[PDB]
Design a protein around this ligand. Structure first.
Ligand SMILES: CCCCCCCCCCCCCC(=O)O
Ligand SMILES: CCCCCCCCCCCCCC(=O)O
Lengths: 390, 390
């Protein structure tokens, strides 16, 4: 064995630790929005956190794993107050201020002396909700593995009562642009839910896929945002994009595609994007460790002359609702990684027939990045408008 | 493909690049001693180097490979005077001063902007010899892969004349000790050839393996050296050692073993070592990439509470002589890697029924480390003495 019980790091794990620097933390995160149960006492949160604070249960893997050289070792002294925070948003708890708080928290490095995760419970969200923000290093999980952890730790049964804390359960065509700039550590997170049936209706009317429509909505929104800052490149943006929107224990194949942001017509943009996705020869399967390794090298350590301007990621979420001690998971937003030369990341999760959009950027490279949420909505409306006339 | 022709780094490659720091370069080296041909003109070296300087031939892989992000790319502009040096040792060219020169050269980092190798030709060595010192990053080759490059680039035929430069051809039981100390970048290299038949005769007389005898010779020598500096630990040194001395395209399995340096009798030391090598349960095969990966993690990124005090490596060399433009390869010495917590490395190569010993150390952790060559000889003589009486 290896030091009696330890496990060597996987090469994938080691990539994300070696590439982490002050200016580019290599953790991912999930913003969970929970609806307080209809029949819950006013002390529902206080009691849930109190059960956590007094619990004698020990974290189960991977939450009890910590680094020891090039090996995963077991944490023998769980330090709750290192990993856990319970705070409240001041009245009236608007989503604006929640996202400010998450932007700040997503900026800070994880301490490598302890298991590489933290958990925030934020009470007082408008609309009778509370939030959990779970930060976890990419050396431990990517989005798909994170989703499996979510499904193991939460319940599909609204009646089941939680008895332990969640962590104890069971070739270079891309132009220069302001997106491609050295980054700071300070982040801006902008998140919003969209009804997936709007994209489904557009796809059916124009005889394309939902993935085609989503990518065209992103393209038009990026074109509008860049134009508003007089920063639209002459050549179109190139992006690493999914081949599909949902694809069986599977990570979706990723494709190098032309986003056609230099065209001024939405149908023209959609047409170029659809063809590019269909016909691109730079296709990166993510079914085997080696395939995932090679994809990770392309994306996080690309060779240079750049190859692409941004990554648009898709992390499938569950189709059936989840619950925490009876509280319904109302929304789930992904927060991914920015790094030098990639100051904007777009990641999306499908959950309950919603498209959960998580935008993460370097605060100083992309000012007012949150405007992209408005540009996205306006682009959906544009496609809906042209179909309404047709 | 990956950027049209490039190749992703192997995880093994990436370990040796990521762990390199100022104080611990991660290159290996070979010191080649050549005998000038009996019928050679006095301008043999001048002409060989001149043929190199004027050659229009291009390096072949791996010598034309260079880093580009997390990928191997092709070097499109070979810069001879970056990679190549021709110097002379001042008269009378003793081996003492050759090893001083190699100690200094083995201390310096390789520039990552170019292919990760350099070649030194040193003329004027005593005894009608010249030396080649070839430095190459472990991200490109380990010892066994290096030996295969040597056999491809040199000739087995004394009559064959070279027409191109060589690069164009075709659980924690180990005590604290001064060996286990943070290191500087400055190196001391101490190299010497021993007749392998002396170890063979000892092995036959005492009914043990040659590997058993070599390890016992190392143990007694290390005990004497440490005692001479009042630095012999009370507990025995633990070492990562080979299971055999020659083992088919194979890397020898490595074993965690008790060197028994706390015993004062050579036969006692030999007995403990032989049993430990036979019975140790920490055995690390190196037949597959995964196995080599895991071995590399143990050795170069060990977990801590250390596990071992040093590594004694064996790199098999050819059994038949090699030649360069008629000049016989008379001797071949390996120079390996020291790092934080491992200030001494012992590596050995079998060539022409000789045991070629290459000792490499942090200059400042182990003063007068070259005395170990004397202690090694004295230990062989000790075993020969006890057999002569028996
Ligand atoms: C119960 C603990 C679950 C932890 C889930 C953390 C969030 C999942 C990652 C979302 C972003 C992934 C980005 C990506 O890999 O493309
Ligand atoms: C023709 C170029 C050949 C380059 C050979 C360089 C020397 C081989 C490495 C010797 C030390 C190896 C240490 C080890 O891996 O255990």
């Amino acid at each position: 064995a290896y030091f009696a019980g330890m496990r060597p790091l996987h090469p994938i794990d080691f990539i994300f630790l070696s590439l982490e620097k002050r200016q580019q933390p290599m953790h991912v995160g999930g913003l969970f929005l929970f609806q307080i149960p209809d029949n819950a006492p006013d002390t529902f949160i206080q009691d849930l956190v109190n059960d956590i604070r007094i619990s004698k249960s020990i974290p189960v893997p991977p939450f009890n794993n910590k680094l020891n050289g090039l090996f995963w070792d077991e944490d023998e002294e769980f330090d709750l107050d290192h990993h856990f925070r319970h705070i409240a948003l001041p009245h009236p708890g608007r989503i604006r201020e929640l996202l400010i708080y998450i932007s700040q928290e997503h900026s800070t490095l994880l301490d490598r002396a302890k298991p590489l995760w933290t958990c925030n419970i934020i009470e007082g969200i408008e609309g009778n909700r509370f939030a959990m923000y779970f930060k976890i290093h990419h050396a431990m999980v990517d989005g798909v593995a994170g989703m499996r952890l979510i499904e193991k730790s939460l319940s599909h049964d609204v009646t089941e009562k939680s008895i332990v804390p969640p962590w104890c359960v069971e070739s270079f065509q891309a132009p220069c642009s302001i997106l491609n700039q050295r980054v700071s550590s300070s982040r801006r997170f902008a998140a919003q839910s969209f009804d997936l049936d709007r994209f489904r209706n557009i796809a059916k009317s124009l005889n394309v896929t939902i993935n085609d429509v989503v990518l065209a909505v992103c393209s038009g929104a990026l074109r509008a945002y860049l134009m508003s800052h007089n920063s639209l490149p002459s050549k179109p943006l190139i992006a690493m994009v999914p081949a599909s929107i949902r694809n069986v224990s599977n990570r979706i194949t990723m494709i190098l595609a032309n986003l056609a942001t230099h065209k001024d017509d939405p149908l023209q943009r959609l047409e170029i994007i659809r063809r590019s996705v269909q016909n691109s020869k730079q296709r990166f399967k993510r079914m085997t460790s080696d395939q995932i390794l090679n994809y990770s090298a392309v994306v996080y350590g690309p060779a240079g002359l750049q190859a692409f301007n941004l990554v648009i990621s898709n992390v499938p979420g569950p189709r059936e609702p989840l619950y925490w001690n009876g509280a319904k998971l109302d929304a789930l937003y992904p927060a991914s990684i920015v790094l030098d030369g990639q100051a904007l990341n777009i990641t999306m999760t499908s959950y309950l027939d919603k498209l959960e959009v998580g935008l993460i950027a370097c605060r100083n490279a992309l000012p007012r990045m949150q405007n992209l949420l408005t540009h996205l909505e306006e682009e959906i409306q544009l496609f809906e408008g042209v179909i309404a006339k047709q």
